[PDB]
Amino acid sequence: EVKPNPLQDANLCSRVFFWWLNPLFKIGHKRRLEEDDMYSVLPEDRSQHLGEELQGFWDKEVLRAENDAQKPSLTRAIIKCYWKSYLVLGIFTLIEESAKVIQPIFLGKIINYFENYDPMDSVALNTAYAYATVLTFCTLILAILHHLYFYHVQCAGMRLRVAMCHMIYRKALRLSNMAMGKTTTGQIVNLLSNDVNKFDQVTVFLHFLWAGPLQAIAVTALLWMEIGISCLAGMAVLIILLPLQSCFGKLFSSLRSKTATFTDARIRTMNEVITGIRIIKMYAWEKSFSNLITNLRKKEISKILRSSCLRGMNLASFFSASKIIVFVTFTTYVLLGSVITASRVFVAVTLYGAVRLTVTLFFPSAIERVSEAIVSIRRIQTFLLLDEISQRNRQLPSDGKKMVHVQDFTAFWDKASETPTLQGLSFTVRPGELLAVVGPVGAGKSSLLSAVLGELAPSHGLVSVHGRIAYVSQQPWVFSGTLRSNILFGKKYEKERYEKVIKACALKKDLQLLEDGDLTVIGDRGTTLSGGQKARVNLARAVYQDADIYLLDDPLSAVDAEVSRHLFELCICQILHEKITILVTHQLQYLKAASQILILKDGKMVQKGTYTEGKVGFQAYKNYFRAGAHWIVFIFLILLNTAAQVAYVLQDWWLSYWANKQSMLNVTVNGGGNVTEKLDLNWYLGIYSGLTVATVLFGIARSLLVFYVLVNSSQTLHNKMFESILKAPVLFFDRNPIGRILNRFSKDIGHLDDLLPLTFLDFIQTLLQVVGVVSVAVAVIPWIAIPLVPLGIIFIFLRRYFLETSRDVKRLESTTRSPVFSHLSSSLQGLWTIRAYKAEERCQELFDAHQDLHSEAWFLFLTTSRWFAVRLDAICAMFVIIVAFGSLILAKTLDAGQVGLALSYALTLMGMFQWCVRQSAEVENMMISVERVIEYTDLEKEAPWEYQKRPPPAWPHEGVIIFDNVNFMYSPGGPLVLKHLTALIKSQEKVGIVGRTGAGKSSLISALFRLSEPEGKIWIDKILTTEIGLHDLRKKMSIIPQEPVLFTGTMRKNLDPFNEHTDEELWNALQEVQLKETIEDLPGKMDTELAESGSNFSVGQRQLVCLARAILRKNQILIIDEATANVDPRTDELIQKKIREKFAHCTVLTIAHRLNTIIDSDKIMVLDSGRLKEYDEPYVLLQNKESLFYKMVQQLG
C-alpha cells in the first residue's frame, strides 16, 4: 500500500527528463512537505539486500585471503562487487568527453564558413546549417544525458554507502568487548557518519582518473593540428597551474591550522564568558574578558585576513588562467611568423577552456576524493578485522536442561592481567531455585550477570547455560520507537499475555499519564522517560519474553521502594514461582523472601551461607554591506568589477578585431601581391599584452577588495555583537540557552569568516561572467534580445517553483540523518541485552528500516537536484541554439570575428550558469547566519556601565543602605516577586536574612545589585542606585556566591584580572586563605595554567580563591550566598572562621538558609505581608512562640 517509486513505471524519456517528478513539486508548491509525501526506495536498493550481497562478497574475499595466507583487502571486495555496474557509466563518460572535445571542431567549421562568406553560394549555407545542427545535437547530448548519467553515478555512490553502513552495523552487533577496551562508541559513530560519507563523493569523479588525462592528451593533439608547436606553450602553463595551486593549498592548510587553534581558544574563553555571565557581571570583570577576547579576535582576524588574501589570489588566478594561456600561446604563435585567423583562434580558445576546466577542477578533486575514500576504506577494514566475541554455541536440544552449574571456573576480563580479578566461580542453580546473591558492591557482580557467557568463555571449568535467558542491564535502555516494539521484541501479539504483563507491572498509571499509551514513540532523545520507567519496561519485556533463566540486576532499585515491593510480591512470588531467578539485591526484604541466598566475597565468595548467619530581504544585504565599508568604496568596487569583466571580454574581442583586420589586409594584398603589407605586430601585440595584463590586475584587485571588504564587515559585525551581548541584561541569558548563543557566535562567525566571503566572491565572479556572455551575444546580434526576455523570465519562475520545494526535501534529509546514528549508539549501549535475547536480526531490521527511510530522502534530494539541473541546462542549450541559428540567419551582416566570439561564449555559458545558480542558492540560504547576527546586534541594552555622576572614591563610607518602597519586578510582563520592602540596615550590621526559600532571596540580591531593574527606592550610602553607572556600583560590591566558578588562564588574573595589586598583597591574601604553599608547589606558580573550569582545583579551593578575591575587593559591605551549603565540614568551618575574623570590620549580609550562618547574625529582618506592624526584635519570639522559628527549632534543632 506504500506509494511505490514512480521510476518503476517511467519510460526512457520520462527518466531522462525526470518528468515523473512533476506531481511532487505540484504538491510541494501548495503545502509544506512531510514524510507521507515520500517515495519508497526501489526494491533492489533496500538496505537489507545491499548489506547481504556485500556480506557475501566480503566473506568470499576473507576466505580467499585466508586460503593464500594474505591480509584481506576491503577495496578488493568493493571492486569485485561494483566494477560490472561501474564500467557502463565509464563508457558513457567516454562518450560525453568525446562529444565535449568534438564540439569545438564543428565550431571551427562554422567559423570557417563565415570566413569564406559568399552570399550567393547556397551549398556553403547548407553545409553551415548541417554543421550547426551537429553542434547543437552534441550540445543537447551533453545538456541532458550528462544529468541522467550524473544521477546514476550518485545513485551508485549511495548504494556503496548504504552497503557499508549495513556492514558496520552488523559487525558492531557481533563486535566484541576488547573492542570497547580499545575502541569507543564515538569512533564507530564517526565511522558511520563521516568515513562512510566519502563514498558518496568519490564515485562522482572516479572515472575522471582515466578521463582527465586521456581527454587532455586528445585536446593537445587537436590543438597541434590547428596551431602546431605553439599549442605546447599554452599547455605548459596549464601544467604549471597544477603544482603551484597545490602549493597554495599547502600554505592555505597551514594557515587554516594557525587560525583554528586561535578560534578554538576564542570560543573556549567565550564559553567561560557565557556560562559564568552572571558571575562576570556581578564581579565587574567584563573589561578584562573583553580585552582578552579582543586580542584573540585580532590575532584570529589577522590570520584569516592572510588566508583570505591567499584564497582570493588563487581564485583570481583560476579566473584569469584562460586569458593567460590564450595570450601566451597566441603570442608564441604570432612571433613564430604565423598569421592568425578567427577560426583557429576561437577553436584554440574553446579547447583551452575545456581542457583547463577539466585539469584544474575535475582531476585534482578526483584525486583528493580517491585519497579520502582510500583512507576511509582502510579505517573501515581495520574496524571489520577487529576480533569479535566467539560465536556462542547454538542451544542444543534442551532434553530437560534447565540447570546451570559452574565448577570453580577462573578467568579475568583482561587475561593479560594475571591478578585474580575473578576466580572461584563454583555454584549450581537448579530449576525453580532463585540465587539472590548479596554483597556490598563486591567486585564481581557483573560476572554473575555475565555468567551466561557474558565474557567468561570457559578456559578452565564447566558452564551449563541451557534454555532461554532474560537479562536486565545495570542501566535499563530503550531504543527509539514505540513502546509496543520494546514489549513484544518480535514476539507475537498475544493480547492476553500482553494485558497480564502490563497490569502486573503496574504500568497502567504510566499509560494513563502518557499522552498516547503503548503506541507512544520514544520522546526526543529519550527525554520523556525516567529510570524507574526504564526499569519497569525492561522488567515487562523480560516477563513477556517468558524465558527460562530470569537474570535480573537491581530492577526494583530504580522504582520506588514501596512500588518495588508490590512488584516483587505480585511477580516474584506468583509469576516467578518456578523460574531461574538469579538476582543481585541491595534491599534486605528481597533476600528475606529468597529461595537461595549467597553471600558473595570479592573473587571467590566466602561461602553459600544462610540469611541468619525564511527569505532574507534586501535589508539584510544592505546592513551587511553598510557594515562592510563606506558606500564610496562600494561604488569603487562595483566599478572595478565592471572594469575586470570588460577587460576579460575585450581581450577576446581584440583577438577577433585582429583577425578581422588581418582578413581585410589579406583581401587587399590578394590583388597585387607584391608589396605584401604586414600588419604591424608591435601595435597589435602591445595592445593585446596590455589588455591581458589589465585583466589579470583587475581580477586580482577585485578579488582582494571583495575579500577585504567582506572580512571587514565580518569583523565589525562580530565586534558590535560582542559589545551588544556584553551589555545585554541577565533576562536575555535566562530566556536563551547557553548552547544557542555559543552556536550563534561559533558557526555563524565561522561562516562569515570562511565561507560567506568565498561564496559571495565566486557568485559575483560567475554572475559577471554570465552577464558578459549574454551581453556579447546581444551586441553581436541585437535581435537575440527579443527571445531573451521570455527565456530569462521563465527561468525566474522555474527557480521559484523549484526552490520552494527543494528546501523542504533538503530539510527532510537532515531530519532523517540523525535517527540512524542514534540507533547504532543505542545498539551499542544495550548490546548486552541484544546478545542475551538472541535478537540481533531484529535490531538489524530496525536499522535497515531507518536507513531505508534515509535512502528515500537521499533519493528524493538527488532526483530533485537533477530535475532542476536538466531544466536550467535546457534553458542554456536553447540559448545556444538561438545564438547559432540566428547567426546563420543574419550571415549577410556579420564578420568572422564577432560570430566566433559569440559562439565561443555561448558554448562556455552552460557550466557557468550551473555554478552561478548553485552559488546564488548557497549565498541566499547561508545569509541566514548574517540575519541572525544582525538580530543579535540589535537586542535590548541596559543602563550604561559608566554614568556622569561619578560618586567620590571610597564611596561606601559607612555602608548605610536604606530601602524605601521596593516593589521588585523580575521579568517585564511577568510576576511581581517582591513588593514594598522597607529594610533599614545600619552601618556594620551582620544581617542573617532569610525567607521565601531561595527564590525570594535570589530576587532580593538581584534587585539590590541593580542586576535586574530595581523598581523601588534604594539609598545605598544615601545615594540612589539610579544615579550611579552600572560598573561603578559593580566594583565596590563584594559578594561570595554559592557557585565558585573558575576561568581558564593564569592564577594572577583569577586573583586580579586588572592587575592593580602588588604581588606582596597577593601573597598576604594567599597566606590568609592558607593556600600559599598550595600554589608554591605548583610548577606554573603565578602563571599556572588551569584545566577546564579549574578541574584540578577542588571546590574548597574554589571558594578559597573566591573569598580571596573578596578580600582583595576591600569593600566595606559584603554579600554571602550559601557558601557552605553542600561542602565538606572542614572547608565549612575554615570558611566560617574566615568570615568571622577576616571580615570583622565589614557590614556583611549573609543571605542563606543555613541555620549556623543565621544564628551568629545579630539581626534578622522579619516580614509579614510587607508591613512590620509589630516593631520588636526577634529575640522575644526566638523561644518557639511563633510559627517559622518553631519549625526550625523542632525539626532542625
Ligand X SMILES: Nc1ncnc2c1ncn2[C@@H]1O[C@H](COP(=O)(O)OP(=O)(O)NP(=O)(O)O)[C@@H](O)[C@H]1O
Cβ proximity to ligand PLM, 675 vs 796, nearer residue:
796
Closest approach of ligand DU0 to the CB of residue 190, in Å = 42
Closest approach of ligand DU0 to the CB of residue 93, in Å = 26
Nearest to 863 by CA among 29, 20, 122, 278: 20
Q: Is 445 in the site for Mg ion (CB under 5 A)?
A: yes
Q: Is 220 in the site for ligand DU0 (CB under 6 A)?
A: no
State the number of binding residues for ligand DU0 (CB under 6 A): 43
HSE at residue 601, side-chain half, CA atoms within 13 A, is 10
Binding residue ranges = 439-446, 995-1002
Beta strands in 451-575 (DSSP E): 469-471, 549-553
| Cα distances (Å, whole numbers) of residue 533 to 60, 558, 909 | 46, 8, 63
Contact 18, 866 (CB under 8 A): yes
920 binds, among Mg ion, ligand X, ligand PLM, none (CB under 5 to 8 A by kind): ligand PLM
| Cα distances (Å, whole numbers) of residue 359 to 61, 93, 210, 252, 288 | 36, 16, 12, 20, 52
Closest approach of ligand DU0 to the CB of residue 757, in Å = 22
916 binds, among ligand PLM, Mg ion, ligand X, none (CB under 5 to 8 A by kind): ligand PLM
Q: What's the rounded Cα separation, in Å, for the pair 664 and 697?
A: 33
441 binds, among ligand PLM, ligand DU0, ligand X, none (CB under 5 to 8 A by kind): ligand X
690 binds, among ligand DU0, ligand PLM, Mg ion, none (CB under 5 to 8 A by kind): ligand DU0
Closest approach of ligand X to the CB of residue 830, in Å = 14
Q: Is 184 in the site for ligand X (CB under 6 A)?
A: no
Q: What's the rounded Cα separation, in Å, for the pair 664 and 1149?
A: 101
Q: What's the rounded Cα separation, in Å, for the pair 584 and 474?
A: 11
Parallel, antiparallel or unpaired: strands 1117-1121 and 1038-1040: parallel
Which one of 445, 604, 980, 1035 is in contact with ligand X (CB under 6 A)?
445
Residues 233 to 272 in contact with ligand DU0, rule: CB under 6 A: 233, 236-237
Cβ proximity to ligand PLM, 800 vs 957, nearer residue:
800
Grid coordinates standing for 748?
555563524
Cβ proximity to ligand PLM, 267 vs 616, nearer residue:
616
Parallel, antiparallel or unpaired: strands 549-553 and 583-584: parallel
HSE at residue 129, side-chain half, CA atoms within 13 A, is 8
Q: What's the rounded Cα separation, in Å, for the pair 372 and 370?
A: 5
State the number of binding residues for ligand X (CB under 6 A): 13
Cα-only R_g, the chain = 39
Q: What's the rounded Cα separation, in Å, for the pair 655 and 684?
A: 9
DSSP state string for 337-371? T----HHHHHHHHHHHHHHHHIIIIIHHHHHHHHH
Closest approach of ligand PLM to the CB of residue 792, in Å = 6
> 554-590 burial, b if ≥16 CB within 10 A, otherwise e?
bbbbbbeeeebbebbeebbeebbeebbbbbbbeeeeb
Q: What is the DSSP letter of 971?
A: S
309 binds, among ligand DU0, Mg ion, ligand X, none (CB under 5 to 8 A by kind): none
Longest distance between any two alpha carbons in the chain, whole Å: 134
Compute CA 124 distance to the chain's CA centroid, rounded to the nearest angstrom: 61
Q: Which ranges constitute the DSSP H helices of 958-1041?
A: 999-1008, 1030-1035
> At CA 812, angle to CA 811 and CA 815, rounded to 5?
90
Cβ proximity to ligand X, 249 vs 442, nearer residue:
442
Place of cell 520520462: 14
Closest approach of ligand X to the CB of residue 558, in Å = 12
Closest approach of ligand PLM to the CB of residue 307, in Å = 27
Residues 448 to 507 in contact with ligand X, rule: CB under 6 A: 449, 474
770 binds, among ligand X, ligand DU0, ligand PLM, none (CB under 5 to 8 A by kind): ligand PLM
Q: Is 593 in the site for ligand DU0 (CB under 6 A)?
A: no
Q: Is 441 in the site for ligand X (CB under 6 A)?
A: yes
Residues 855-894, one symbol each (x = binds ligand DU0 by CB under 6 A, - = not), give ----------------x--x-------------------x
Cβ proximity to ligand DU0, 180 vs 229, nearer residue:
229
Place of cell 597577593: 1066
Chain contacts with ligand PLM (rule: CB under 6 A): 615, 767, 770, 796, 800, 803, 916-917, 920, 924
Q: Is 839 in the site for ligand DU0 (CB under 6 A)?
A: no
Cβ proximity to ligand X, 597 vs 1146, nearer residue:
597
Cβ proximity to ligand PLM, 736 vs 920, nearer residue:
920
- Region label for 445, one of left (φ > 0), alpha (ψ between -120 and 50) or beta (otherwise): alpha
Cβ proximity to ligand X, 153 vs 549, nearer residue:
549
DSSP state string for 755-798? IHHHHHHHHHHHHHHHHHHHHHHHHH-GGGHHHHHHHHHHHHHH
Compute CA 194 distance to the chain's CA centroid, rounded to the nearest angstrom: 11
Contact 555, 524 (CB under 8 A): no
Q: What's the rounded Cα separation, in Å, for the pair 713 and 620?
A: 13
Cβ proximity to ligand DU0, 694 vs 1193, nearer residue:
694
Residues 525 to 564 in contact with ligand X, rule: CB under 6 A: 554
398 binds, among Mg ion, ligand PLM, ligand X, none (CB under 5 to 8 A by kind): none
| Cα distances (Å, whole numbers) of residue 373 to 195, 311, 385 | 8, 26, 18
Compute CA 754 distance to the chain's CA centroid, rounded to the nearest angstrom: 15
Closest approach of ligand X to the CB of residue 447, in Å = 6
Give the residue closest to ligand DU0 by C-beta: 690
Q: What is the DSSP letter of 1120?
A: E
Which one of 117, 413, 795, 821 is in contact with ligand X (CB under 6 A)?
413
Q: Which stretch binds ligand X (CB under 6 A): 119-127, 446-454, 1004-1012, 1119-1127?
A: 446-454
Q: Is 447 in the site for ligand X (CB under 6 A)?
A: yes
Residues 318-347, one symbol each (x = binds ligand DU0 by CB under 6 A, - = not), give ----------x---x--xxx----------
> 602-622 burial, b if ≥16 CB within 10 A, otherwise e?
ebbbeeeeeeeeeebeeebee
Binding residue ranges for ATP = 439-446, 995-1002
445 binds, among ligand PLM, Mg ion, ligand DU0, none (CB under 5 to 8 A by kind): Mg ion
Beta bridge partners of 1017: 964
Q: What's the rounded Cα separation, in Å, for the pair 1186 and 1159?
A: 17
Q: Which stretch binds ligand DU0 (CB under 6 A): 232-240, 293-301, 531-539, 1027-1035?
A: 232-240
Residues 485 to 504 in contact with ligand DU0, rule: CB under 6 A: none
474 binds, among Mg ion, ligand DU0, ligand X, none (CB under 5 to 8 A by kind): ligand X
Cβ proximity to ligand X, 584 vs 1123, nearer residue:
584
Closest approach of Mg ion to the CB of residue 413, in Å = 12
Q: Which stretch binds ligand X (CB under 6 A): 46-54, 309-317, 442-450, 1107-1115?
A: 442-450
Which parts of this chain interact with ligand DU0 (CB under 6 A)? 229, 232-233, 236-237, 328, 332, 335-337, 639, 642-643, 645-646, 649-650, 653, 680, 682-683, 686-687, 689-690, 693-694, 697, 771-772, 775-776, 778-780, 782, 797-798, 801, 871, 874, 894, 898
Which parts of this chain interact with ligand X (CB under 6 A)? 413-414, 421-422, 441, 443-447, 449, 474, 554
Which parts of this chain interact with Mg ion (CB under 5 A)? 445-446
